[PDB]
Amino acid sequence: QSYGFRPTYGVGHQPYRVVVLSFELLHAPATVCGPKKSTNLVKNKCVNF
C-alpha cells in the first residue's frame, strides 16, 4: 500500500526519515574507529593503552 504524504497533514501523518545504525562491539578487527590521534608506542613500562 502507498502512503498519502501531504504537507497539509499535521503531526502523525508527515513523512519522517528514520536511520538505524547497527554496530558490532565484539572484540574483532575494526576499521570504523572515531578519528582521534595516534601516539607513540612505549614498551616495558606501566602506561595506559
Binding site: 565484539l26 572484540h27 574483532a28 578487527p29
Partner: peptide, 18 residues
C-alpha cells in the same frame, strides 16, 4: 549415486575470534 558415510572427528570450526 548416493552413499552413506560417517564423520568421526570432523566438522568443528572457530566460533569466535578470540
Amino acid at each position: 549415486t548416493q552413499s552413506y558415510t560417517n564423520s568421526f572427528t570432523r566438522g568443528v570450526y572457530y566460533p569466535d575470534k578470540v
